Structure formats: C-alpha cells, structure tokens
C-alpha cells in the first residue's frame, strides 16, 4: 500500500529506495538516538510523511508502567466529586459514551502508528465531549474536558500507557503539535496522568492558552498571504 | 551650545548601550528559563514542546510580516512604473 | 542649535524610564529564577511565562499587520491620484 502510494513522484520512490533503516539497526541497539534520527529524517524531507510513518512504525524500553496501574486501582476510591466533572452516568446515553471513550483509550495500545494511537485518543476525547454535552445539554468548556479525560484513564486501564505515550513522543512528526487536535488531546492526556499522582485548572488553562495562540498564529500566517496577494493581485489590474 | 550637544551625546549613547545591554541580560534570563524547560524530571514534555512549537511558529511570522511589507512595496514600485 | 539640545534631552529621558522598565522586567526574571531550582511545579508556571511572552509577540505581529495595511492603503491612494 505504501509502495503503491509512493509510486503514483518517483522521488518518493527514491525515498522508497532510501528506506535510515540500516542506521536504525545500528544506533538503536544501544533509545534516545532513534528519536533524534527519525526526527532528523523527517526534518530533512506531502502525506507521504504519514505513509513513511505508517511503514516505519509497522516495522520498527516499553516496560515498567506498573506505577500508574497500582496508583490507578488505588485511585478507584475517586468519585466524580472533586473532579467536579459534568458527567452523570445514570442517563444511558452518556454511560454509553463513557464506555466507548474507555473502549477507545484501551484500543490505543493495539494500534499501529503513533498517529493511529493519536486517532484513538481523539475519539476518546470526542466521546468525552459527548458525555459532557449530553449531561449538561450544553457544549463542554475547556476546563471541563481535562478532568473528565483523566476519569476515563482513571477507570479502565489502557494496556501499556506510559509505554505508548513515550513511544509516540519518540517518533511521530511534530508537524503534529501545531494546530489540530490529536496532539492537543495528547498533551491533555499527559497533563491527565501527570496530575493523577498527588493544580488541574492551570493544566486546562495552559492548554487553552497554547492552543489559541496557535490558532491565531495560523490565521495571521494566512492574512499575510491574503493581504500580499490582494494588494499584488490588484496593483496589476491597472 | 556645542558643549551641551557634546555631553548629551555622551550621556545618550551611554544610556543606549546600557539599555541595550540590559535587554540582552533579560533575553538571557528568558533563555535560561527556556533551558529550565527540558530536563530529566517534572517534565510533561508535551506542554514544554507545545510552548516550543508556538514560539517557533511566531518567529517565522516575523519573516512573514517583514517580507509581506517588502513584497507589497516591490508591488508599489511597479505602480511607480505606471506612467 | 537648541533644536538638537531639547531633542537630545527628550531622547535621553525616554531612554531612561524605558530602561528602568527593562530593569523591573530583568529583576522579576531574577526573582523568579531564584526559587524552586527544580521540580516544585514552578516550571509549569515557567511554561505559562513562555505562553504570555508568545502572547505579547503574537499581538505585536497582529497590530503590526493592521498598520501595514493602512500605510499601504493611503500610500496606494497617493500613487493612484498621483
């Protein structure tokens, strides 16, 4: 599939002939090296980046996450009070949203690419937004989202979580972290787990913070082009 | 007259080089905090490397805005060609 | 020529209060750095500082664009009628 995608330019087929793979076999036998190498490979080189990720992840630590598990089955005593979460699981429709928010986050570890783990953790976030929205009959507020997410990680135990989150950070293309969700939902997961070991509001507010200025940035990045053209586009009418 | 124009230039240029040095001191304390970001512990690499992507996206927009200004002006130059 | 003299004083004064302003900034950066050397959750608040710094810059760029539009707008008006 990656071969058929690369074929149909031929410079992408030169990337098919290029394969960093032998260099990976060399440097990764002694962990932080392969992260910088993959990031360098991505920096040197358009959806073919996701296809190269799709290949390299399918082919190419991952242990000791227990500390979370013991701490989660610990935190079993925690009720949606003091998480102040807007989720009322009595109504069937939200209980069904919660269940498959969890089902998603479980499904993550099973996944192929880091990006496909990212796809999972969006849908988890989306179902969380649904659980909240159906509860209060009103769209979730950003301050609501983060706690509710932990609650989904706090009950139900995704196989090998910290393994997953370190693996995604290691390689996936940080063209990720700019505008778009899967990485905003990601950084929310990080904030979630990091919080779990004993403020929340700060973590929510800070995520809102960064996400906005990145929205505004990708706007101004455009309006520059819009203005540039609009004036050039028009200086030459007459 | 010349006198207070000789001494004020002295004091003004001494104020400028002091001010500009202070700014650099500030920019170094800032960079130090940017270097306090990534470490072994209490990380959330996620948040840190978000804040990175942000400020990296803005420091291109300065080349963007500058070049937006110089490219609009080069268009003005051809409107000057109109005659 | 007191034209210069009176402008030099103005520029000197402006450089001074602006410098003091640069200093209060430097000071609090120092006061911030001296505390919680590691792991106090003060480097989350360091991340919000990087936030606000990027938020003053983002806006400088925004208002910079809007003015650039006007300068070009009225300049275009000139080169039109002239």
Numbering used by the authors:
A (entry chain A): 141 to 148, 150 to 160, 163 to 173, 175 to 189, 205 to 219, 231 to 368, 391 to 430
B (entry chain C): 553 to 635
C (entry chain B): 553 to 634
Task: Give excerpts from the publication.
In this process, small GTPase Rab5 functions as a master regulator of the early endosomal biogenesis. Rabex-5 is a specific GEF for Rab5, Rab17, and Rab21. Rabaptin-5 is a key effector of Rab5 and plays an important role in both homotypic and heterotypic fusions of early endosomes. The GEF activity of Rabex-5 is autoinhibited by its CC domain and is activated by the binding of Rabaptin-5 via its C2-1 domain.
In the R2Δ complex, the linker between the Rabex-5 GEF and CC domains was removed to facilitate the crystallization. On the other hand, in the structure of the R2Δ complex, Rabaptin-5C212 forms 2 two-helix bundles with a V-shaped conformation, and Rabex-5CC interacts via the nonpolar surface with the C-terminal regions of Rabaptin-5C212 to form a tight three-helix bundle. Rabex-5CC (residues 413–452) forms a long amphipathic α-helix (about 60 Å) that is in agreement with the prediction by Delprato and Lambright (2007). It packs in parallel with the C-terminal α-helices of Rabaptin-5C212 to form a tight three-helix bundle with its nonpolar surface buried in a hydrophobic surface groove of Rabaptin-5C212. The interactions are dominantly hydrophobic that bury a total of solvent accessible surface area of 2664 Å2. The GEF domain packs along the three-helix bundle formed by Rabex-5CC and Rabaptin-5C212. The interaction interface buries a total of solvent accessible surface area of 1040 Å2, which is much smaller than that between Rabex-5 and Rab21 (2400 Å2). Hence, we consider that the substrate-binding site of Rabex-5 is largely exposed to the solvent and partially accessible by the substrate. In the structure of the R2Δ complex, the substrate-binding site of Rabex-5 is partially occupied by Rabex-5CC and Rabaptin-5C212, implying that further conformational change(s) of the R2Δ complex will be required to bind Rab5. The not-so-tight interaction of the Rabex-5 GEF domain with Rabex-5CC and Rabaptin-5C212 as observed in the R2Δ structure allows the conformational changes easily during the substrate binding.
